[PDB]
Design a protein around this ligand. Structure first.
Ligand SMILES: COc1cc(CNC(=O)C2CC3(C2)CN([C@H](C)c2cccc4ccccc24)C3)ccn1
Ligand SMILES: COc1cc(CNC(=O)C2CC3(C2)CN([C@H](C)c2cccc4ccccc24)C3)ccn1
Ligand SMILES: [Zn+2]
Ligand SMILES: [Zn+2]
Ligand SMILES: [Zn+2]
Ligand SMILES: [Zn+2]
Lengths: 314, 314
């Protein structure tokens, strides 16, 4: 016998069709290219959680590859379908202005997207893709619906599933214009010797291992390629911002030492991001809710700092 | 005494504030730059219809003029506020796929916007403004929410008020890339003589006075600048399409003679637009509703034709 599921298919997000789909075949073998909640489910077999959900059917068109590359800088023929189906969810989200910044109301595990949006409103940055920059322009004014849908598409993430704000910044900053961002590190191994690495681009602004920007300037531990544990320190930095990242741990945020930060309470499976910014005192933006603080001591994961140009003291 | 109205103000379209505003002053003198339903009401005094409506407050920012010019090709400092407040209405509209084309469900007098959207999906055209072209790209796939909000902003029109599809095409095609569109007319006055006018750009594709494209090729009446009634006929046309327009009157649409058309039933104050296209037979798209026809005889207002290059016979 055949075990089926009841689902709905649509091509306009208005008129639906009842479908009893066979779990023996993929959605692509049923309907063609199919998307659900911002994810491509073309080569995906039906699963019991899909019952009652509506599926977006968008047939492929080779003539649109040139256009999609112009606006979004992508060659993925599924980007359009995932962007539209994710936007069908984000346009219903609420974007309240908290602490003079655009935040996002709690919905579909967007508490990590809220932290990404709040940090981007405080660092000087521009994106190369025209559609991503126009959406970023409207998001800074309050209309962040298209912007979050783009961030979801660029990260190959699904509406509802949790994500890391650090991982998402990696995927997003590849389309930023960090061409003139430069970072010079001096790795000091006690077997191999001293070593200059000139990192540029997305790598010149992001570090993983520590939250303190002064810790990187003075010296932070790191395993050398020979196996031994070495030490590297920042020699020259040249960008508009830096983003320090580290796994969750109790970090103490002082006033005037940083630009903004993100914290994460919970295990690896489930947790809640909240955003901290420095204005006249420390603000904590938990979605649509705001708290005020002289200082914050919690599980910080990412910290942002302002920069123009730095050089170590000889 | 002072006569007031009860209204709501917001800066996020989520959190509202009750306001009792004085009709003696404008909304700008109350709150700053203020928008309502896609219209700038900054220098507008409160009126009894505004009771219960929510107003969008967006303060001015001179640093955004350069950005807004890049994405939208506009120097109007109110374009952003009118675009966002109009988009807050169009995202709730329904865009059903009728006859293989993206139409719009009846709402807020959008029956003229539906006719504009349906014609743009059948003529070969591209827009210069990047944000307008990306929205046009998504509208051709089904997501026309941002596109209609842009058309409303470019036309300085308000959500809910009726409009002409011909007038709206004029405002919209100024941002199209019709740089290589050329039209040559020969005006023949029986007092002044024969006269060549080389029309280019938005004027090379649009004519007002007749619906028949063969009537313009053969000869159509027109008052000369001397007062007498002359006659002009098309000598050379060089574009991807032409749009013939005329006030409402019974026109008989045959199969295979045109690309698509718009009709309008009613007086000058109120009326309903419906769209006719030619596929295997004549389709009539009245919003979310479709009728099929061997031919249509009704009050046609605008007709579109396909073109590549034309030259009159010597
Ligand atoms: C079998 O289904 C799953 C489901 C999940 C869902 N979870 C995620 O998507 C993760 C995205 C994070 C949760 C990882 N981020 C925090 C800040 C984090 C980073 C690095 C190390 C950590 C160590 C301990 C706790 C948190 C850490 C947010 C994951 C895996 N399998
Ligand atoms: C005092 O408030 C008003 C309200 C309106 C509302 N109406 C409009 O916005 C017009 C946009 C049209 C209605 C004009 N279009 C039709 C096709 C049309 C064009 C040219 C000539 C016509 C002659 C007779 C009937 C229709 C004609 C659509 C107007 C004025 N004052
Ligand atoms: Zn959440
Ligand atoms: Zn070593
Ligand atoms: Zn209507
Ligand atoms: Zn004359």
């Amino acid at each position: 016998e055949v075990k089926t599921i009841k689902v709905f298919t649509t091509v306009d997000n208005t008129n639906l069709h009842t479908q009893l789909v066979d779990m023996s075949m993929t959605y692509g073998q049923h309907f063609g290219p199919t998307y659900l909640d911002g994810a491509d489910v073309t080569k995906v077999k039906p699963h019991v959680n899909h019952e009652g959900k509506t599926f977006f059917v968008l047939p492929s068109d080779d003539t649109l590859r040139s256009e999609a590359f112009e606006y979004y800088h992508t060659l993925d023929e599924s980007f359009l379908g995932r962007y539209m189906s994710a936007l069908n969810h984000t346009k219903k989200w609420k974007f309240p202005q908290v602490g003079g910044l655009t935040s996002i109301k709690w919905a579909d595990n967007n508490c990590y997207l809220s932290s990404v949006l709040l940090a981007l409103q405080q660092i000087e940055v521009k994106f190369n893709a025209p559609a991503l920059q126009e959406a970023y322009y409207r998001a800074r004014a309050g209309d962040a619906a298209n912007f979050c849908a783009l961030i979801l598409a660029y990260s190959n993430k699904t509406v509802g599933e949790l994500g890391d704000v650090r991982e998402t910044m990696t995927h997003l900053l590849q389309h930023a214009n960090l061409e003139s961002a430069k970072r010079v590190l001096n790795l000091v191994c006690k077997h191999c010797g001293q070593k200059t690495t000139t990192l540029m681009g997305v790598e010149a602004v992001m570090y993983m291992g520590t939250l303190s920007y002064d810790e990187l300037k003075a010296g932070v531990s790191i395993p050398c390629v020979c196996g031994r544990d070495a030490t590297q320190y920042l020699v020259q930095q040249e960008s508009s911002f830096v983003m320090m990242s580290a796994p969750p741990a109790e970090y103490k945020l002082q006033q005037g030492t940083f630009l903004c930060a993100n914290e994460y309470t919970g295990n690896y499976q489930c947790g809640h991001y909240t955003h901290i910014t420095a204005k006249e005192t420390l603000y904590r933006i938990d979605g649509a809710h705001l708290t005020k603080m002289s200082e914050y001591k919690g599980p910080v994961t990412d910290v942002f700092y302002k920069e123009t140009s730095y050089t170590t003291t000889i």
